């Protein structure tokens, strides 16, 4: 069905109403998103159907049609944008500048917004609109709001 | 099942909202993918 690129809202007729679970990037015939909004099943455009392609519990990632395309990475110096696309909101530019999790394996960017767990997917950008990771895996801090990691996959 | 609605373009907006702070969290990754903080 729709394959052009931009940002696009996850939903479900599953439970009361239309839900929205998450988000996902549309990007060189390939939709990116969290592996915990889909865990793994197929999606449907209009009459459309997209099947996943890879996918991983750990990064939290999956991508459908294709190989992962994002390989955009924070700079660890500049502000970054999180395209925000909250539930029943509107999309929205959120600029702040990120956060370290020091990691055993390294360190990561971390964006510290709070948003509802269905704004999992959205897209958090560099000053040229690159997608440099996903918002939607992270933590909760002392002081329980979300603290969310910068996640980005592999280009093969 | 799940389907997908466009909800956008991916661009950079100048003079957006600039809002949230930059913390340096000690964190553990477990092999289902979650994030816990090490203190
Ligand atoms: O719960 C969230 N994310 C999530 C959930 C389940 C799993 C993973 C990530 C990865 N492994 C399985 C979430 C995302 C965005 C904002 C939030 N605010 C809040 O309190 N939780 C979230």
Known sequence: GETTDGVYRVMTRRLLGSTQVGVGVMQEGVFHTMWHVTKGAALRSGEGRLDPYWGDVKQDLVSYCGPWKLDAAWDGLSEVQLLAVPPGERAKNIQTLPGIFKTKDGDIGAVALDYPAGTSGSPILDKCGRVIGLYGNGVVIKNGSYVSAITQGKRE | ?39
């Open chain 2, 1 to 39: 099942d799940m389907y997908i609605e466009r909800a956008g373009d991916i661009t950079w907006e100048k003079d957006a909202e600039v809002t949230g702070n930059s913390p340096r969290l000690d964190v553990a990754l477990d092999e289902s993918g979650d994030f816990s903080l090490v203190e």
